[PDB]
Protein backbone atom coordinates (compact mmCIF):
# COMPACT_ATOMS: atom_id res chain seq x y z
CA UNK A 1 0.00 0.00 0.00
CA UNK A 2 2.77 2.43 0.95
CA UNK A 3 4.34 1.76 -2.44
CA UNK A 4 1.32 3.64 -3.79
CA UNK A 5 2.33 6.85 -2.04
CA UNK A 6 5.98 6.26 -2.89
CA UNK A 7 5.12 5.81 -6.59
CA UNK A 8 3.01 8.96 -6.77
CA UNK A 9 5.74 10.96 -5.01
CA UNK A 10 8.42 9.59 -7.35
CA UNK A 11 6.27 10.57 -10.34
CA UNK A 12 5.64 14.10 -9.06
CA UNK A 13 9.38 14.31 -8.44
CA UNK A 14 10.12 13.22 -12.00
CA UNK A 15 7.84 16.04 -13.17
CA UNK A 16 9.71 18.43 -10.88
CA UNK A 17 13.03 17.08 -12.17
CA UNK A 18 12.22 17.76 -15.82
CA UNK A 19 10.64 21.16 -15.10
CA UNK A 20 13.66 22.23 -13.04
CA UNK A 21 16.11 20.86 -15.61
CA UNK A 22 14.41 23.13 -18.15
CA UNK A 23 14.62 25.97 -15.62
CA UNK A 24 18.39 25.49 -15.28
CA UNK A 25 18.98 24.89 -19.00
CA UNK A 26 17.25 28.19 -19.76
CA UNK A 27 20.30 29.94 -18.30
CA UNK A 28 22.68 28.12 -20.63
CA UNK A 29 20.47 28.77 -23.65
CA UNK A 30 19.79 32.44 -22.95
CA UNK A 31 23.49 33.11 -22.43
CA UNK A 32 23.89 32.19 -26.10
CA UNK A 33 20.76 34.16 -26.96
CA UNK A 34 22.39 37.21 -25.37
CA UNK A 35 25.65 36.53 -27.20
CA UNK A 36 23.43 36.89 -30.27
CA UNK A 37 21.57 40.00 -29.11
CA UNK A 38 24.80 41.95 -28.57
CA UNK A 39 24.77 42.47 -32.33
CA UNK A 40 21.59 44.54 -32.11
CA UNK A 41 23.11 46.94 -29.57
CA UNK A 42 26.49 47.29 -31.26
CA UNK A 43 25.02 47.86 -34.73
CA UNK A 44 22.53 50.42 -33.41
CA UNK A 45 25.37 52.23 -31.64
CA UNK A 46 27.43 52.27 -34.84
CA UNK A 47 24.57 53.64 -36.94
CA UNK A 48 23.76 56.36 -34.40
CA UNK A 49 27.36 57.51 -34.14
CA UNK A 50 27.53 57.42 -37.94
CA UNK A 51 24.63 59.87 -38.02
CA UNK A 52 26.28 62.33 -35.65
CA UNK A 53 29.66 61.86 -37.35
CA UNK A 54 28.03 62.81 -40.65
CA UNK A 55 26.62 65.86 -38.88
CA UNK A 56 30.15 66.76 -37.75
CA UNK A 57 31.50 66.24 -41.28
CA UNK B 1 -11.42 -6.20 27.51
CA UNK B 2 -8.84 -7.94 29.69
CA UNK B 3 -10.33 -11.29 28.57
CA UNK B 4 -7.58 -11.39 25.94
CA UNK B 5 -4.74 -9.23 24.66
CA UNK B 6 -4.91 -6.21 22.38
CA UNK B 7 -5.55 -6.09 18.63
CA UNK B 8 -2.49 -4.19 17.45
CA UNK B 9 -1.76 -3.33 13.81
CA UNK B 10 0.89 -1.72 11.63
CA UNK B 11 0.61 1.64 9.89
CA UNK B 12 2.69 4.42 8.37
CA UNK B 13 2.48 8.16 7.75
CA UNK B 14 3.35 10.72 5.10
CA UNK B 15 3.75 14.35 6.09
CA UNK B 16 5.64 17.45 5.02
CA UNK B 17 9.07 17.72 6.60
CA UNK B 18 8.29 20.95 8.45
CA UNK B 19 5.04 19.63 9.94
CA UNK B 20 6.60 16.29 10.92
CA UNK B 21 7.88 17.66 14.24
CA UNK B 22 4.64 19.29 15.39
CA UNK B 23 2.51 16.34 14.33
CA UNK B 24 4.69 13.76 16.07
CA UNK B 25 4.65 16.05 19.11
CA UNK B 26 0.86 15.78 19.07
CA UNK B 27 1.27 12.00 18.78
CA UNK B 28 3.50 12.15 21.87
CA UNK B 29 0.71 14.06 23.63
CA UNK B 30 -1.72 11.34 22.55
CA UNK B 31 0.56 8.43 23.51
CA UNK B 32 -1.17 5.51 21.75
CA UNK B 33 1.46 4.79 19.07
CA UNK B 34 4.93 3.26 18.96
CA UNK B 35 7.46 4.41 16.37
CA UNK B 36 9.77 2.27 14.26
CA UNK B 37 13.23 3.02 12.88
CA UNK B 38 13.24 3.23 9.08
CA UNK B 39 17.01 3.59 8.78
CA UNK B 40 18.63 0.95 11.02
CA UNK B 41 21.08 0.32 8.19
CA UNK B 42 23.24 3.18 9.51
CA UNK B 43 23.72 4.63 12.97
CA UNK B 44 21.24 7.07 14.51
CA UNK B 45 24.05 9.65 14.80
CA UNK B 46 24.34 9.59 10.98
CA UNK B 47 20.72 10.43 10.12
CA UNK B 48 19.27 13.72 8.81
CA UNK B 49 19.18 15.44 12.23
CA UNK B 50 22.48 14.61 13.95
CA UNK B 51 23.33 18.09 15.24
CA UNK B 52 19.83 18.45 16.65
CA UNK B 53 20.30 15.51 19.01
CA UNK B 54 23.91 16.48 19.72
CA UNK B 55 22.86 19.88 21.01
CA UNK B 56 19.97 18.47 23.06
CA UNK B 57 22.41 16.09 24.74
CA UNK B 58 24.83 18.94 25.43
CA UNK B 59 22.07 21.22 26.71
CA UNK B 60 20.86 18.52 29.06
CA UNK B 61 24.46 18.08 30.18
CA UNK B 62 24.65 21.77 31.05
CA UNK B 63 21.26 21.68 32.76
CA UNK B 64 22.51 18.75 34.85
CA UNK B 65 25.58 20.82 35.72
CA UNK B 66 23.47 23.75 36.89
CA UNK B 67 21.15 21.36 38.73
CA UNK B 68 24.18 19.91 40.52
CA UNK B 69 25.16 23.46 41.43
CA UNK B 70 21.61 23.89 42.75
CA UNK B 71 21.80 20.75 44.90
CA UNK B 72 25.18 21.86 46.22
CA UNK B 73 23.57 25.24 46.95
CA UNK B 74 20.40 25.69 49.02
CA UNK B 75 17.87 26.88 46.42
CA UNK B 76 15.06 24.42 45.55
CA UNK B 77 13.80 23.53 42.07
CA UNK B 78 10.23 24.24 41.02
CA UNK B 79 7.98 21.20 40.54
CA UNK B 80 5.26 23.46 39.17
CA UNK B 81 3.35 20.64 37.46
CA UNK B 82 3.42 22.17 33.98
CA UNK B 83 4.69 19.78 31.30
CA UNK B 84 4.37 21.65 27.99
CA UNK B 85 5.25 20.41 24.54
CA UNK B 86 8.53 21.89 23.31
CA UNK B 87 8.02 24.52 20.57
CA UNK B 88 8.98 23.38 17.09
CA UNK B 89 9.72 26.96 15.87
CA UNK B 90 13.31 28.20 15.77
CA UNK B 91 12.63 29.61 19.24
CA UNK B 92 14.60 26.44 19.87
CA UNK B 93 17.69 28.55 19.21
CA UNK B 94 16.40 31.23 21.61
CA UNK B 95 16.22 28.57 24.32
CA UNK B 96 19.73 27.56 23.28
CA UNK B 97 20.97 31.15 23.63
Amino acid sequence: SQSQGIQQLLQAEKRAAEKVADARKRKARRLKQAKEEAQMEVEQYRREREQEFQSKQ
Amino acid sequence: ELFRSEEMTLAQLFLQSEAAYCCVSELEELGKVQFRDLNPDVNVFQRKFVNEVRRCEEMDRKLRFVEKEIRKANIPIMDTGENPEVPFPRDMIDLEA
Partner: protein, 430 residues
Protein backbone atom coordinates in the same frame (compact mmCIF):
# COMPACT_ATOMS: atom_id res chain seq x y z
CA UNK C 1 -9.84 29.87 -4.55
CA UNK C 2 -8.69 30.18 -8.17
CA UNK C 3 -8.33 26.52 -9.06
CA UNK C 4 -11.84 25.20 -8.40
CA UNK C 5 -13.57 28.03 -10.24
CA UNK C 6 -11.12 27.66 -13.14
CA UNK C 7 -11.95 23.95 -13.32
CA UNK C 8 -15.69 24.69 -13.21
CA UNK C 9 -15.33 27.30 -15.95
CA UNK C 10 -13.40 24.92 -18.21
CA UNK C 11 -16.59 22.82 -18.23
CA UNK C 12 -19.31 25.49 -17.97
CA UNK C 13 -19.61 25.89 -21.72
CA UNK C 14 -22.75 27.52 -23.13
CA UNK C 15 -23.98 28.42 -26.61
CA UNK C 16 -22.13 31.48 -27.89
CA UNK C 17 -24.93 31.88 -30.46
CA UNK C 18 -27.28 33.00 -27.68
CA UNK C 19 -25.72 36.48 -27.87
CA UNK C 20 -25.23 36.71 -31.64
CA UNK C 21 -28.96 36.05 -31.99
CA UNK C 22 -29.48 38.84 -29.46
CA UNK C 23 -27.22 41.05 -31.59
CA UNK C 24 -24.77 41.74 -28.76
CA UNK C 25 -21.80 40.39 -30.77
CA UNK C 26 -20.86 39.91 -34.41
CA UNK C 27 -21.32 36.82 -36.57
CA UNK C 28 -17.58 36.60 -37.24
CA UNK C 29 -16.85 36.80 -33.51
CA UNK C 30 -19.28 33.99 -32.71
CA UNK C 31 -17.95 31.94 -35.62
CA UNK C 32 -14.34 32.46 -34.51
CA UNK C 33 -15.02 31.29 -30.98
CA UNK C 34 -17.05 28.28 -32.16
CA UNK C 35 -14.40 27.29 -34.71
CA UNK C 36 -11.62 27.71 -32.14
CA UNK C 37 -13.50 25.51 -29.67
CA UNK C 38 -13.90 22.84 -32.35
CA UNK C 39 -10.24 23.21 -33.39
CA UNK C 40 -8.72 21.73 -30.26
CA UNK C 41 -5.49 20.03 -31.37
CA UNK C 42 -2.37 22.18 -31.14
CA UNK C 43 -1.90 22.39 -34.91
CA UNK C 44 -5.56 23.33 -35.39
CA UNK C 45 -5.32 26.02 -32.69
CA UNK C 46 -2.24 27.44 -34.41
CA UNK C 47 -4.04 27.35 -37.76
CA UNK C 48 -6.97 29.30 -36.31
CA UNK C 49 -4.68 31.83 -34.61
CA UNK C 50 -2.66 32.28 -37.81
CA UNK C 51 -5.59 32.44 -40.26
CA UNK C 52 -8.00 34.61 -38.21
CA UNK C 53 -5.55 36.21 -35.80
CA UNK C 54 -6.99 39.69 -36.29
CA UNK C 55 -10.43 38.40 -35.27
CA UNK C 56 -9.18 36.48 -32.21
CA UNK C 57 -8.60 39.17 -29.59
CA UNK C 58 -11.50 41.17 -31.04
CA UNK C 59 -13.84 38.23 -30.40
CA UNK C 60 -12.47 37.87 -26.87
CA UNK C 61 -12.88 41.59 -26.17
CA UNK C 62 -16.36 41.86 -27.70
CA UNK C 63 -17.74 38.91 -25.74
CA UNK C 64 -16.05 39.94 -22.48
CA UNK C 65 -17.36 43.50 -22.91
CA UNK C 66 -20.96 42.70 -23.84
CA UNK C 67 -21.62 39.51 -21.84
CA UNK C 68 -23.81 39.64 -18.74
CA UNK C 69 -23.54 36.10 -17.36
CA UNK C 70 -20.01 35.39 -16.19
CA UNK C 71 -19.71 31.78 -17.34
CA UNK C 72 -18.85 32.64 -20.96
CA UNK C 73 -16.51 35.52 -20.02
CA UNK C 74 -14.72 33.32 -17.49
CA UNK C 75 -14.55 30.67 -20.22
CA UNK C 76 -12.72 33.05 -22.54
CA UNK C 77 -10.38 34.25 -19.78
CA UNK C 78 -9.56 30.73 -18.57
CA UNK C 79 -9.00 29.67 -22.18
CA UNK C 80 -6.52 32.52 -22.71
CA UNK C 81 -4.73 31.67 -19.46
CA UNK C 82 -4.53 27.96 -20.33
CA UNK C 83 -3.38 28.84 -23.86
CA UNK C 84 -0.59 30.96 -22.40
CA UNK C 85 0.32 28.00 -20.17
CA UNK C 86 0.36 25.73 -23.23
CA UNK C 87 2.52 28.25 -25.12
CA UNK C 88 3.53 31.53 -23.49
CA UNK C 89 3.94 33.05 -26.96
CA UNK C 90 0.15 33.41 -27.29
CA UNK C 91 0.59 36.96 -25.96
CA UNK C 92 1.58 37.82 -29.54
CA UNK C 93 -1.92 37.50 -31.02
CA UNK C 94 -3.26 40.29 -28.79
CA UNK C 95 -0.43 42.59 -29.88
CA UNK C 96 -1.02 41.76 -33.54
CA UNK C 97 -4.71 42.59 -33.10
CA UNK C 98 -3.96 45.86 -31.30
CA UNK C 99 -1.44 46.94 -33.94
CA UNK C 100 -3.91 46.14 -36.72
CA UNK C 101 -6.44 48.25 -34.80
CA UNK C 102 -3.84 51.05 -34.49
CA UNK C 103 -3.99 50.93 -30.70
CA UNK C 104 -2.03 49.94 -27.63
CA UNK C 105 -3.08 46.76 -25.85
CA UNK C 106 -4.15 48.23 -22.52
CA UNK C 107 -7.39 50.24 -22.95
CA UNK C 108 -9.11 47.08 -24.22
CA UNK C 109 -8.42 45.15 -21.00
CA UNK C 110 -7.83 47.55 -18.10
CA UNK C 111 -11.56 48.40 -17.65
CA UNK C 112 -12.28 44.69 -17.08
CA UNK C 113 -10.42 44.88 -13.76
CA UNK C 114 -13.30 47.04 -12.48
CA UNK C 115 -15.91 44.35 -13.16
CA UNK C 116 -17.79 42.69 -10.34
CA UNK C 117 -16.63 39.07 -10.27
CA UNK C 118 -13.37 38.56 -8.33
CA UNK C 119 -12.54 35.48 -10.41
CA UNK C 120 -12.98 37.28 -13.73
CA UNK C 121 -11.16 40.46 -12.67
CA UNK C 122 -8.19 38.54 -11.29
CA UNK C 123 -7.99 36.29 -14.36
CA UNK C 124 -7.92 39.43 -16.50
CA UNK C 125 -5.09 40.57 -14.23
CA UNK C 126 -3.13 37.34 -14.77
CA UNK C 127 -3.64 37.69 -18.53
CA UNK C 128 -2.45 41.31 -18.46
CA UNK C 129 0.63 40.37 -16.45
CA UNK C 130 1.55 37.59 -18.88
CA UNK C 131 0.87 39.77 -21.94
CA UNK C 132 2.80 42.84 -20.81
CA UNK C 133 5.65 40.89 -19.22
CA UNK C 134 6.37 38.61 -22.18
CA UNK C 135 5.57 41.03 -24.99
CA UNK C 136 7.64 43.83 -26.47
CA UNK C 137 4.96 46.33 -25.42
CA UNK C 138 5.50 47.20 -21.77
CA UNK C 139 2.97 49.10 -19.69
CA UNK C 140 3.79 52.75 -19.16
CA UNK C 141 2.50 56.07 -17.88
CA UNK C 142 -1.09 56.44 -16.73
CA UNK C 143 -1.88 52.88 -17.84
CA UNK C 144 0.74 51.27 -15.60
CA UNK C 145 -0.20 53.77 -12.90
CA UNK C 146 -3.80 52.53 -12.93
CA UNK C 147 -2.78 48.88 -13.19
CA UNK C 148 -0.53 49.05 -10.14
CA UNK C 149 -3.16 51.21 -8.45
CA UNK C 150 -5.59 48.32 -8.96
CA UNK C 151 -2.97 45.97 -7.52
CA UNK C 152 -2.69 48.32 -4.53
CA UNK C 153 -6.47 48.48 -4.06
CA UNK C 154 -6.77 44.69 -4.14
CA UNK C 155 -4.00 44.55 -1.53
CA UNK C 156 -5.91 47.16 0.47
CA UNK C 157 -8.67 44.62 1.12
CA UNK C 158 -6.21 43.16 3.64
CA UNK C 159 -9.85 33.97 3.44
CA UNK C 160 -10.91 33.99 -0.21
CA UNK C 161 -9.85 37.63 -0.49
CA UNK C 162 -6.35 36.66 0.66
CA UNK C 163 -6.34 33.75 -1.79
CA UNK C 164 -7.14 36.31 -4.50
CA UNK C 165 -4.35 38.50 -3.13
CA UNK C 166 -2.29 35.44 -4.01
CA UNK C 167 -3.07 36.19 -7.67
CA UNK C 168 -2.52 39.90 -7.06
CA UNK C 169 0.99 39.19 -5.79
CA UNK C 170 1.54 36.68 -8.58
CA UNK C 171 0.78 39.33 -11.18
CA UNK C 172 2.97 41.80 -9.33
CA UNK C 173 5.85 39.30 -9.30
CA UNK C 174 5.49 38.25 -12.94
CA UNK C 175 5.74 41.96 -13.73
CA UNK C 176 8.65 42.80 -11.42
CA UNK C 177 10.48 40.00 -13.24
CA UNK C 178 11.23 42.79 -15.75
CA UNK C 179 13.21 45.80 -14.58
CA UNK C 180 10.93 48.65 -15.67
CA UNK C 181 8.02 47.48 -13.53
CA UNK C 182 10.39 47.27 -10.55
CA UNK C 183 11.21 50.97 -10.73
CA UNK C 184 7.53 51.72 -11.38
CA UNK C 185 6.49 49.77 -8.27
CA UNK C 186 9.14 51.45 -6.11
CA UNK C 187 8.06 54.85 -7.44
CA UNK C 188 4.54 53.93 -6.39
CA UNK C 189 3.79 53.30 -2.72
CA UNK C 190 3.31 49.63 -3.53
CA UNK C 191 6.32 48.59 -1.48
CA UNK C 192 4.55 50.23 1.46
CA UNK C 193 1.56 48.04 0.52
CA UNK C 194 3.80 44.97 0.77
CA UNK C 195 5.01 46.16 4.17
CA UNK C 196 1.45 46.75 5.34
CA UNK C 197 0.11 43.40 4.19
CA UNK C 198 3.11 41.55 5.68
CA UNK C 199 2.68 43.29 9.03
CA UNK C 200 -1.05 42.53 8.86
CA UNK C 201 -0.28 38.78 9.27
CA UNK C 202 -1.00 37.54 5.76
CA UNK C 203 -0.87 33.85 4.89
CA UNK C 204 2.17 31.67 4.37
CA UNK C 205 2.05 31.57 0.56
CA UNK C 206 1.59 35.34 0.52
CA UNK C 207 4.66 35.73 2.76
CA UNK C 208 6.69 33.70 0.28
CA UNK C 209 5.35 35.85 -2.57
CA UNK C 210 6.19 39.20 -0.99
CA UNK C 211 9.63 38.00 0.07
CA UNK C 212 9.96 36.96 -3.57
CA UNK C 213 9.15 40.55 -4.51
CA UNK C 214 11.62 42.09 -2.05
CA UNK C 215 14.22 39.57 -3.25
CA UNK C 216 13.60 40.82 -6.79
CA UNK C 217 14.04 44.41 -5.59
CA UNK C 218 17.24 43.51 -3.73
CA UNK C 219 18.60 41.91 -6.90
CA UNK C 220 18.78 45.40 -8.42
CA UNK C 221 21.48 47.66 -6.91
CA UNK C 222 19.39 50.83 -7.07
CA UNK C 223 16.15 49.19 -5.93
CA UNK C 224 18.08 47.60 -3.07
CA UNK C 225 19.29 51.10 -2.22
CA UNK C 226 15.71 52.39 -2.47
CA UNK C 227 13.99 49.89 -0.21
CA UNK C 228 15.98 50.83 2.91
CA UNK C 229 13.30 53.48 3.44
CA UNK C 230 11.23 50.55 4.75
CA UNK C 231 13.90 48.30 6.33
CA UNK C 232 12.16 44.92 5.98
CA UNK C 233 14.94 43.13 7.89
CA UNK C 234 13.64 43.79 11.43
CA UNK C 235 10.35 42.16 10.41
CA UNK C 236 11.93 39.35 8.40
CA UNK C 237 14.47 38.33 11.05
CA UNK C 238 11.88 37.50 13.69
CA UNK C 239 9.27 36.20 11.22
CA UNK C 240 11.91 33.71 10.10
CA UNK C 241 11.58 32.14 13.57
CA UNK C 242 8.04 30.99 12.78
CA UNK C 243 8.43 30.45 9.00
CA UNK C 244 10.56 27.32 9.29
CA UNK C 245 9.17 26.10 5.96
CA UNK C 246 11.83 25.54 3.31
CA UNK C 247 10.12 27.91 0.84
CA UNK C 248 10.09 30.97 3.10
CA UNK C 249 13.43 30.28 4.80
CA UNK C 250 15.15 29.86 1.43
CA UNK C 251 13.65 33.01 -0.04
CA UNK C 252 14.50 35.15 3.02
CA UNK C 253 18.07 33.85 2.93
CA UNK C 254 18.26 34.76 -0.76
CA UNK C 255 16.91 38.25 -0.05
CA UNK C 256 19.53 38.66 2.69
CA UNK C 257 22.31 37.70 0.28
CA UNK C 258 20.87 40.12 -2.27
CA UNK C 259 20.89 42.97 0.25
CA UNK C 260 24.49 42.43 1.27
CA UNK C 261 25.62 41.78 -2.32
CA UNK C 262 23.91 44.57 -4.25
CA UNK C 263 24.20 47.23 -1.55
CA UNK C 264 25.76 50.11 -3.47
CA UNK C 265 28.14 51.49 -0.82
CA UNK C 266 30.27 50.24 2.04
CA UNK C 267 27.98 52.31 4.27
CA UNK C 268 24.94 50.63 2.69
CA UNK C 269 26.41 47.20 3.44
CA UNK C 270 27.14 48.39 6.98
CA UNK C 271 23.56 49.61 7.43
CA UNK C 272 22.05 46.31 6.27
CA UNK C 273 24.56 44.20 8.20
CA UNK C 274 24.07 46.28 11.36
CA UNK C 275 20.33 45.72 11.15
CA UNK C 276 21.05 42.02 10.75
CA UNK C 277 23.48 41.66 13.65
CA UNK C 278 21.57 43.87 16.09
CA UNK C 279 18.55 41.68 15.28
CA UNK C 280 20.71 38.58 15.81
CA UNK C 281 20.86 37.09 12.30
CA UNK C 282 24.38 35.75 12.81
CA UNK C 283 23.47 33.10 15.38
CA UNK C 284 20.56 32.02 13.18
CA UNK C 285 22.94 31.72 10.22
CA UNK C 286 25.25 29.54 12.32
CA UNK C 287 22.30 27.34 13.31
CA UNK C 288 21.17 27.03 9.69
CA UNK C 289 24.75 26.23 8.66
CA UNK C 290 24.68 23.38 11.17
CA UNK C 291 21.43 22.51 9.39
CA UNK C 292 21.44 20.97 5.91
CA UNK C 293 18.86 21.28 3.14
CA UNK C 294 17.66 19.94 -0.21
CA UNK C 295 19.27 22.23 -2.79
CA UNK C 296 22.36 24.35 -3.29
CA UNK C 297 20.86 27.80 -2.85
CA UNK C 298 19.92 27.60 0.85
CA UNK C 299 23.32 26.41 2.05
CA UNK C 300 25.39 28.44 -0.42
CA UNK C 301 23.49 31.56 0.68
CA UNK C 302 23.95 30.72 4.37
CA UNK C 303 27.69 30.33 3.77
CA UNK C 304 27.89 33.60 1.83
CA UNK C 305 25.94 35.38 4.57
CA UNK C 306 28.25 33.97 7.23
CA UNK C 307 31.22 35.28 5.24
CA UNK C 308 29.76 38.75 4.79
CA UNK C 309 28.36 39.07 8.32
CA UNK C 310 31.73 37.99 9.68
CA UNK C 311 33.45 40.62 7.57
CA UNK C 312 30.99 43.24 8.83
CA UNK C 313 31.57 42.11 12.42
CA UNK C 314 35.32 42.49 11.93
CA UNK C 315 34.79 45.95 10.42
CA UNK C 316 32.65 47.05 13.37
CA UNK C 317 35.37 45.55 15.59
CA UNK C 318 37.94 47.80 13.92
CA UNK C 319 39.88 49.84 16.47
CA UNK C 320 38.89 52.99 14.58
CA UNK C 321 35.25 51.99 14.89
CA UNK C 322 35.65 51.49 18.64
CA UNK C 323 37.15 54.97 19.04
CA UNK C 324 34.49 56.48 16.78
CA UNK C 325 31.58 54.92 18.69
CA UNK C 326 33.15 56.20 21.91
CA UNK C 327 33.28 59.67 20.35
CA UNK C 328 29.71 59.35 18.98
CA UNK C 329 28.15 57.99 22.17
CA UNK C 330 27.10 54.76 20.44
CA UNK C 331 27.83 52.47 23.40
CA UNK C 332 24.93 50.25 22.36
CA UNK C 333 26.25 46.68 21.99
CA UNK C 334 27.94 46.84 18.61
CA UNK C 335 29.78 43.56 17.88
CA UNK C 336 33.09 45.18 18.85
CA UNK C 337 31.91 45.15 22.46
CA UNK C 338 31.43 41.37 22.67
CA UNK C 339 34.06 40.24 20.13
CA UNK C 340 36.61 38.77 22.53
CA UNK C 341 39.32 38.56 19.86
CA UNK C 342 39.06 42.31 19.31
CA UNK C 343 39.51 42.91 23.03
CA UNK C 344 42.58 40.67 23.14
CA UNK C 345 44.07 42.41 20.10
CA UNK C 346 43.24 46.03 20.94
CA UNK C 347 42.86 46.38 24.72
CA UNK C 348 46.17 48.28 24.53
CA UNK C 349 44.50 50.69 22.11
CA UNK C 350 42.58 52.18 25.04
CA UNK C 351 45.92 53.66 26.17
CA UNK C 352 46.25 55.62 22.92
CA UNK C 353 46.13 59.42 22.89
CA UNK C 354 47.06 59.29 26.58
CA UNK C 355 44.13 57.09 27.59
CA UNK C 356 41.53 59.28 25.87
CA UNK C 357 39.30 56.24 25.32
CA UNK C 358 39.28 55.39 29.03
CA UNK C 359 38.76 59.09 29.76
CA UNK C 360 35.67 59.10 27.54
CA UNK C 361 34.42 55.99 29.32
CA UNK C 362 35.01 57.43 32.79
CA UNK C 363 33.37 60.74 31.88
CA UNK C 364 30.37 58.86 30.52
CA UNK C 365 30.23 56.94 33.80
CA UNK C 366 29.00 60.21 35.36
CA UNK C 367 27.54 61.89 32.24
CA UNK C 368 25.48 59.08 30.62
CA UNK C 369 21.75 59.63 31.04
CA UNK C 370 21.15 56.50 28.97
CA UNK C 371 21.39 53.37 31.17
CA UNK C 372 22.60 51.39 28.15
CA UNK C 373 25.51 53.79 27.65
CA UNK C 374 26.31 53.81 31.37
CA UNK C 375 26.29 50.01 31.60
CA UNK C 376 28.42 49.63 28.47
CA UNK C 377 30.90 52.18 29.82
CA UNK C 378 31.26 50.28 33.10
CA UNK C 379 31.55 46.95 31.28
CA UNK C 380 34.18 48.25 28.86
CA UNK C 381 36.13 49.75 31.77
CA UNK C 382 36.15 46.32 33.40
CA UNK C 383 37.13 44.61 30.15
CA UNK C 384 40.09 46.97 29.84
CA UNK C 385 41.45 45.77 33.18
CA UNK C 386 40.69 42.16 32.21
CA UNK C 387 42.65 42.43 28.96
CA UNK C 388 45.49 44.77 30.06
CA UNK C 389 46.97 44.10 33.53
CA UNK C 390 48.56 47.53 34.07
CA UNK C 391 45.13 49.10 33.55
CA UNK C 392 44.29 48.38 37.19
CA UNK C 393 46.14 51.47 38.39
CA UNK C 394 44.95 53.49 35.38
CA UNK C 395 41.33 52.75 36.34
CA UNK C 396 42.06 53.54 39.98
CA UNK C 397 43.54 56.86 38.85
CA UNK C 398 40.61 57.71 36.56
CA UNK C 399 38.06 56.66 39.19
CA UNK C 400 36.54 53.87 37.10
CA UNK C 401 37.14 51.57 40.06
CA UNK C 402 34.98 53.69 42.35
CA UNK C 403 32.52 54.56 39.60
CA UNK C 404 31.71 50.94 38.73
CA UNK C 405 31.80 49.72 42.33
CA UNK C 406 29.20 52.42 43.00
CA UNK C 407 27.13 52.00 39.82
CA UNK C 408 26.58 48.41 40.82
CA UNK C 409 24.07 50.31 42.97
CA UNK C 410 22.73 52.28 39.99
CA UNK C 411 18.98 52.73 39.64
CA UNK C 412 18.79 50.43 36.59
CA UNK C 413 19.39 46.73 37.19
CA UNK C 414 21.08 46.46 33.80
CA UNK C 415 23.64 49.09 34.84
CA UNK C 416 24.00 47.36 38.22
CA UNK C 417 24.65 44.02 36.50
CA UNK C 418 27.21 45.40 34.05
CA UNK C 419 28.96 47.30 36.85
CA UNK C 420 29.17 44.09 38.89
CA UNK C 421 30.70 42.39 35.86
CA UNK C 422 33.23 45.22 35.55
CA UNK C 423 34.15 45.12 39.24
CA UNK C 424 34.61 41.35 38.89
CA UNK C 425 37.01 42.09 36.03
CA UNK C 426 38.95 44.47 38.28
CA UNK C 427 39.01 41.77 40.98
CA UNK C 428 40.05 39.04 38.52
CA UNK C 429 43.19 38.99 40.69
CA UNK C 430 45.16 41.28 43.03
Amino acid sequence: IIAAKAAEVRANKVNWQSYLQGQMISAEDCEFIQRFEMKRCSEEKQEMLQTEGSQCAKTFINLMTHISKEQTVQYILTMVDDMLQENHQRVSIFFDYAKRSKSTAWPYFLPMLNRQDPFTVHMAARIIAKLAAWGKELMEGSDLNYYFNWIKTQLSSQSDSSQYVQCVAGCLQLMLRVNEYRFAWVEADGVNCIMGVLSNKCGFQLQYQMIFSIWLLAFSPQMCEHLRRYNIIPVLSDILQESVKEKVTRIILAAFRNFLEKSTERETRQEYALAMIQCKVLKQLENLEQQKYDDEDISEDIKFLLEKLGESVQDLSSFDEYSSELKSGRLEWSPVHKSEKFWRENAVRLNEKNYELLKILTKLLEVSDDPQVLAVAAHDVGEYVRHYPRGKRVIEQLGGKQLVMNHMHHEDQQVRYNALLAVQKLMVHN
